[PDB]
Design a protein around this ligand. Structure first.
Ligand SMILES: CCCCCCCCCCCCCCCC(=O)SCCNC(=O)CCNC(=O)[C@H](O)C(C)(C)COP(=O)(O)OP(=O)(O)OC[C@H]1O[C@@H](n2cnc3c(N)ncnc32)[C@H](O)[C@@H]1OP(=O)(O)O
Length: 469
């Protein structure tokens, strides 16, 4: 680390392989040349498309992603054409009779699985000399590949956590104010406990400082735990204003406070670590950006988790039908009641136009350490623009009415496999010296580790075992 990072135009090219391989898998599956029953060929193809391709893209072919993105796509298209040439239900009454329910979407499963796979690879890949130094994290100002996961995980959690509000809306009795706090504590208990355990153990660890990231005591597992508890209190205010109008206000207030004078920056950068507040400045101050990211994720998760469009679902959680509203509908309810793709396109366009003008006037640059406005804009725009393609692929190929096994397996056992991967890298880091390894040895070690994780994950999934911590 310690070097200025790369650019966005390289990060996009490096990370597009996750969507390219998904499209290739869909094409190959629809080519109909594969045998119907499960076999070794299916597992080999799945493992080569999911795990190995990302490993090659991150490490060896990092200097030529455009050449890698075609050798996977073209043969599958040729096979699809060959199969198509060689080869010899939706009802409106159902939609009328259907009520409002939650549904499990496949592209969300793929989007969650790919991020976990990439995180699991890149956690260990950073300790070897074959991993380019441009992708390592940067201190204060700068952009890199490893500064995006921290925002992406918060965005994904915000997207998912809206189904609780959608479900509780159908309830005929309002839960008490003290009951939601208990629910939030129950949801965040394991993360809070694992975060607190590190404070009691750092003294025994006596590892490197790394204080400048979050502080002496603060941690990411506390930031993830405290968000729902704080956002519980916000609902009475949202009774009067839309949810996004709170994120906008918070972002504007924080940016005005940062750009008003240089005193705040001087305190944040040069102040001595004397008292508790001075020893955890960054962890406390990045909360005002993480809250905005979480709120925007929650707002985005309103029109994706349903099974049919409802009334005013672009900005409000609602279950009212639009069939009765279709009689002499106004010009507002016609535009603010959309299918998932229509909402995603509108929000992507608005955020692109806002960011393209914000980036031309901000004197400073992106900074994860403080989580200022440009970082949030970049994090949100990237995720919206990837979800748009992920959703469009399903509509083009027509499967909205399962996905590769290695994606579902890693999606169904997230936290446990994350901890297992962390322990594995911790073991390899002490079983050998990494910085003095030859490239072939490094590649073999990475391949063996990937195979071990994949085998364990699939074995847990087949036998129907789900571990909740
Ligand atoms: C493509 C890549 C793009 C981004 C590309 C950018 C770069 C990407 C990083 C790369 C650069 C290296 C890496 C940097 C970053 C670090 O180096 S480190 C980052 C730090 N990471 C962490 O701390 C891990 C955080 N983990 C968590 O927040 C969570 O525990 C997990 C593991 C993500 C998910 O946990 P969980 O929510 O308990 O999971 P789970 O119970 O399975 O699901 C929860 C809910 O979702 C529901 N659900 C699940 N699937 C679905 C579905 N398909 N539909 C609907 N609902 C669903 C479940 O039914 C459940 O519903 P409820 O029961 O809540 O009602």
């Amino acid at each position: 680390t310690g070097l200025n990072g790369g650019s966005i135009t390289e990060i996009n090219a490096v990370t597009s392989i996750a969507l390219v391989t998904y499209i290739s898998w869909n094409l190959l599956k629809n080519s109909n040349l594969m045998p119907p029953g499960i076999s070794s060929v299916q597992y080999i193809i799945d493992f080569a498309l999911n795990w190995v391709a990302l490993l090659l893209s991150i490490t060896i072919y990092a200097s030529e992603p455009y050449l890698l993105n075609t050798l996977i796509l073209l043969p599958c298209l040729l096979a699809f054409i060959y199969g198509k040439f060689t080869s010899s239900i939706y009802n409106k009454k159902k939609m009328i009779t259907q009520r409002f329910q939650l549904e499990k979407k496949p592209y969300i499963t793929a989007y969650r699985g790919g991020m976990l796979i990439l995180t699991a690879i890149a956690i260990l890949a950073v300790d070897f000399p074959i991993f380019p130094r441009r992708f390592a994290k940067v201190e204060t100002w700068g952009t890199s590949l490893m500064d995006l996961g921290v925002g992406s995980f918060v965005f994904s959690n915000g997207i998912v956590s809206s189904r609780a509000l959608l479900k509780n809306l159908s309830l005929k009795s309002k839960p008490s104010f003290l009951k939601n706090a208990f629910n939030a504590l129950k949801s965040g208990g394991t993360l809070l406990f694992l975060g607190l355990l590190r404070l009691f153990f750092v003294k025994n660890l006596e590892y490197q400082e790394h204080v400048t990231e979050y502080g002496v005591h603060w941690n990411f597992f506390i930031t993830l735990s405290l968000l729902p508890l704080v956002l519980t209190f916000i609902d009475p205010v949202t009774r009067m204003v839309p949810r996004c109008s709170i994120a906008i206000f918070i972002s504007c207030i924080y940016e005005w406070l940062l750009l008003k004078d240089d005193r705040t920056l001087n305190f944040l950068i040069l102040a001595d670590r004397n008292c508790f507040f001075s020893a955890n400045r960054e962890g406390i101050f990045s909360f005002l950006g993480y809250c905005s990211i979480f709120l925007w994720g929650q707002n985005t998760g309103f029109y994706l988790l349903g099974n049919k469009p409802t009334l005013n679902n672009l900005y409000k959680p609602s279950t009212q039908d639009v069939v009765a509203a279709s009689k002499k509908s106004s010009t507002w309810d016609y535009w603010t009641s959309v299918t998932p793709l229509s909402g995603l396109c509108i929000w992507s366009t608005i955020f692109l136009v806002i960011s393209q003008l914000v980036f031309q006037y901000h004197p400073y640059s992106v900074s994860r350490r403080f989580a200022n406005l440009p970082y949030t804009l970049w994090v949100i725009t990237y995720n919206l623009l990837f979800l748009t393609g992920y959703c469009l692929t399903d509509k083009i190929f027509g499967n909205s009415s399962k996905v590769a096994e290695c994606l579902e397996s890693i999606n169904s056992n997230g936290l446990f496999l994350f901890l297992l991967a962390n322990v594995s890298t911790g073991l390899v880091n002490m079983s050998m010296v990494t910085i003095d390894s030859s490239p072939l040895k490094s590649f073999l070690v990475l391949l063996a580790y990937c195979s071990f994780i994949a085998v364990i994950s699939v074995f847990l999934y087949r036998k129907r075992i789900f571990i909740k911590l």
